[PDB]
Structure formats: C-alpha cells, structure tokens
Write a protein that binds this ligand. Structure first.
Ligand code: HEM
Ligand SMILES: Cc1csc[n+]1C
Length: 291
C-alpha cells in the first residue's frame, strides 16, 4: 500500500494557519466542556486514535485516509467519547471545506498541544480522503488493563521504540478517564489542561494503591485524588521504561523535544511525501500572534 501526500489545490502556509487559528479560537470559546477542562485533551486523543490504527507491515490504517468519518471506525468501542472531538471540529470543516479529513483531525491534535502550552509540533499537509472500504477494522487500538511487555509489543506495530513510547505516554497528564467511555475513572494530576511533564513526576512521587472502580476494573489510585491505568503504572515496573521516566521527570525540555518528534512521527506514519512537497509548517500560537 503506497499513500502519497497531495497538497490541497493551491493551498499554502497561510491557509492552514487560518484553520489553526479557527480551532484555537474555538478552544478558547468552548471552555466549559468536561467540567472546564475544555476540548484540548479529547482533540489530542482523537489525533492519536486516527493514527494509532496504522500497521507497519502492510501500511494499512494510519492518519492518511481520514476513515474515522466512516461508521465502522466511528463506532469502534475503543473510540467511545471521541464523538465530542468530531462534533467540535465539524463547524471548522464547514468553514474550510477544502481541507481533507485526515489533515483536519491531525491538525486539531497539533493545535490543542501548542495552545495548552506544549512544544511546537512540525505538521505536514497532504492527507487525502479514501473510500469507506479502506476503513481499518476494530481492534487495532491498545487495551488499558495490561502490562509493560504488552505496551512494548503493541507499539512495535507502529514502530515506536521505548523512548518514543514513554515520551508519547506523557500526554496522559492531560484530561481524564471517564467511566462511561472506558470503565476507568479519574484524572492523573492537577494540571490536566496545561501540557507539562507531571505524568512522570506523579508516577514517581505519589503513593499508589491498586483499587477496583465502579465498572469493576482495577486501577492505581492515590491519596491526592489521581489515578493511573495498569498500562500507565507499567512504566515504573519495567527497568528500561523506568529509567526514561526518571529522565523526563528530571528534564522538562528533553520531554518536550522528544514528545514533539514522536507525535509528528505518529501523525505521519504511512505517508509518502514527494521531494517537491513543502517543508513542515510550524504554526504560531494565538498568543504569539497577539490574537
Ligand atoms: C497503551 C497506550 C494507551 C492506552 C491503553 C490508552 C488508554 C486510554 C484510556 C482508557 C483513556 C480514557 C478514555 C476515556 O474514558 O475518556 C485514555 C485517555 C487519553 N489518552 Fe490514552 N492511551 C494510550 C496511549 C495514549 C497516547 C500515546 C496518547 C497521546 C499521544 C494518549 C492520549 C490520551 C489523552 C489526551 C486522553 C484524555 C482524553 C480525555 O480527557 O477525554 N493516549 N487513554
Ligand atoms: C488522566 C488519564 C487519562 S488516561 C491516563 N491518564 C493518566
């Protein structure tokens, strides 16, 4: 399967910076969502789940085709709760009907991270919508109730290595688990709509307790009111993972730099970019624009 990036006709940096600003302006406006967390965390989760279907072996799945717009992927049990990120973006797609679905879902994730004061993420245009029959089947996204060997093995399919996996998981400092979506409940920290390295700090400094929640699932709970998933706590159980966790709890700039590279790579897996294709765009935030 080859998927070649095709820039939307005649579009350039300024067009996509207009779509960025539209998403970012609505993130500021619709602030009440999920008890004032706002839409940013569900939008970086949506960009991860449309990319996380990729399989390196046959180049199926991935962010290129925008296939989450089809019922099979929209109704995947693993995507429960992401309909709220879709409905947030649907106004903006009506306003810029020329951007492809893959591009709009991935730029929403980029915009949310930078607007929640994360690192800049280089983003590239050119994903092309593909037919309903290209939609990957349910079951390619990871279970939460498993251990470190499962996480390592699952992420080899998206060929991410240990460092990349640990840098990507730092995004679980954002938002929260919702019992009616996943059977898990609670936030992982106090700053859950500002991008920081707090996931790593909480993992190493809190007093975790294995408890059973109302959906009868086990999760790691702390006195402070935070929770960690079994696959999250996995990172301090494995010796290779645990020493990268310590590296990111001791250096927030290295965390930001490595997250930026692994999230771009995540979003680009499966796509062939021609050598005459434009460079990756670095978008300015509303704040850097005085907007
Ligand atoms: C083995 C890996 C992973 C598993 C099992 C997993 C699982 C989960 C689960 C069960 C939730 C709760 C969903 C809900 O109830 O609403 C969640 C939320 C979230 N995850 Fe993951 N995740 C994984 C990796 C990642 C990665 C790599 C990213 C992003 C780079 C990510 C970003 C998020 C975000 C931002 C949320 C919060 C959503 C919200 O607030 O609504 N996840 N994760
Ligand atoms: C807050 C959250 C959602 S999924 C994992 N964590 C830590």
């Amino acid at each position: 399967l080859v998927h070649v990036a095709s820039v939307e006709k005649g579009r350039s940096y300024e067009d996509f910076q207009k779509v960025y600003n539209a998403i970012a302006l609505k993130l500021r406006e619709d602030d009440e969502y999920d008890n004032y967390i706002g839409y940013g965390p569900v939008l970086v989760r949506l960009a991860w789940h449309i990319s996380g279907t990729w399989d390196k072996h046959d180049n199926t799945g991935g962010s290129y085709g925008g296939t989450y717009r089809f019922k099979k992927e929209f109704n995947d049990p693993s995507n429960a709760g992401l309909q709220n990120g879709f409905k947030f973006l649907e106004p903006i797609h009506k306003e810029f009907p020329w951007i492809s679905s893959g591009d709009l879902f991935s730029l929403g994730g980029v915009t949310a991270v930078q607007e929640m004061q994360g690192p800049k993420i280089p983003w590239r245009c050119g994903r092309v919508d593909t037919p309903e029959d290209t939609t990957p089947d349910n079951g390619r996204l990871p279970d939460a109730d498993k251990d470190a060997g499962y996480v390592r093995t699952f992420f080899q399919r998206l060929n991410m290595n240990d460092r990349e996996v640990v840098a990507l998981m730092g995004a679980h400092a954002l938002g929260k688990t919702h019992l009616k979506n996943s059977g898990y409940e609670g936030p992982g920290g106090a700053a859950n709509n500002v991008f920081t390295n707090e996931f790593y700090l909480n993992l190493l400094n809190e007093d975790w307790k294995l408890e059973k929640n109302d959906a009868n699932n086990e999760q790691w709970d702390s006195k402070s009111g935070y929770m960690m998933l079994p696959t999250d706590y996995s990172l301090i159980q494995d010796p290779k993972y645990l020493s990268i966790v310590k590296e990111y709890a001791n250096d927030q700039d290295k965390f930001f730099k490595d997250f930026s590279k692994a999230f771009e790579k995540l979003l680009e897996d499966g796509i062939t970019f021609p050598k005459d294709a434009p460079s990756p765009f670095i978008f300015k935030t509303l704040e850097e624009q005085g907007l």
